[PDB]
DNA sequence: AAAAAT
């Protein structure tokens with residue numbers, strides 16, 4: 390009954406009602422393992438397979454249900470077969486018991502710790518965070534110190550009442566210095582997610598001067614420092630150049646923060662909870678972009694990561710276009726394509742518009 | 751420095 394399924398996430402509608410979580414959770418574990426081991430192509434195969442299954446409006450209950458579904462190779466179909474058999478993946482279970490996997494997941498869960506540092510610590514014989522933190526020869530970056538100091542709060546995922554409380558704080562701070570500014574919550578929460586590892590925002594101003602737009606993130610973070618809310622701050626100045634071709638991280642001015650979010654600012658509706666210290670450390674990402682690039686930045690920062698990947702792949706292989714967070718370039722017409730909305734980008738790409746809550750690829 | 755942060 391269902392229409393042909395595209396190999397591209399940007400040509401699929403993926404809502405949060407996942408009927409194939411048994412399969413997807415196992416494929417996500419297998420993808421994450423090849424990623425920490427730096428096997429791009431094998432991880433890529435599991436990510437694409439996981440992504441297609443998330444788009445299905447029904448659960449896979451037999452191998453005949455896998456017919457006509459793209460991105461399901463022989464290796465992926467044997468994993469599906471094993472899960473149909475007893476409800477569990479022996480392959481994912483072996484990864485979960487692997488010493489490298491456990492250590493890499495554990496070490497990279499620390500803010501300021503990436504693949505290189507996790508690898509360094511694993512090859513040194515470390516297996517637990519307790520032994521890393523208490524070691525006398527190791528030296529930590531200021532990001533890693535914050536990562537270890539606020540670890541429990543940061544490893545606890547942010548919920549919607551918390552994200553909304555942060556949105557109010559961001560909007561009140563930004564409107565203080567730029568009353569004409571547009572503040573949009575991006576990331577997972579824009580896609581309708583109930584949790585996240587952080588909260589993301591896109592800030593833009595139609596009438597700000599070059600200086601007002603450069604100074605805004607400094608004014609907002611200083612305002613929070615004065616109030617004692619800024620636990621961690623790292624502001625990356627713009628490396629954005631208007632005429633370079635779109636050919637990881639974008640070049641806009643941005644900041645990676647840890648905010649002290651007072652529980653009193655959260656409208657939780659939840660009762661029976663224990664207040665403890667009365668606040669929670671929340672990872673917050675702010676992006677400032679020039680007004681004319683607002684649609685590309687919004688598309689880039691809304692995600693999901695797989696939706697973004699397939700958008701760029703589709704643009705390259707199907708349209709001979711170059712897309713990133715700053716622009717869209719048409720290699721045939723030899724012209725940069727302008728957009729005032731996400732809808733105009735989809736139209737330029739010849740794609741049916743996919744709503745933010747349908748981008749959960 | 752490389753590395754981290756989306």
Ligand SMILES: Cc1cn([C@H]2CC[C@@H](COP(=O)(O)OP(=O)(O)OP(=O)(O)O)O2)c(=O)[nH]c1=O
Pocket residue numbers: 575576577578582584585586587589689690691692693694697698756
């Ligand atoms: C890191 C990363 C991110 N992106 C885009 C797409 C998403 C946004 C926000 O990032 P995030 O990981 O928090 O995403 P989010 O979906 O909000 O996930 P969480 O709920 O926080 O886990 O950035 C990307 O294109 N490539 C990447 O490698």
Ligand SMILES: [Mg+2]
Pocket residue numbers: 576577585586587588589
């Ligand atoms: Mg996020």
Ligand code: NA
Pocket residue numbers: 496497498499500501502503
């Ligand atoms: Na990390």
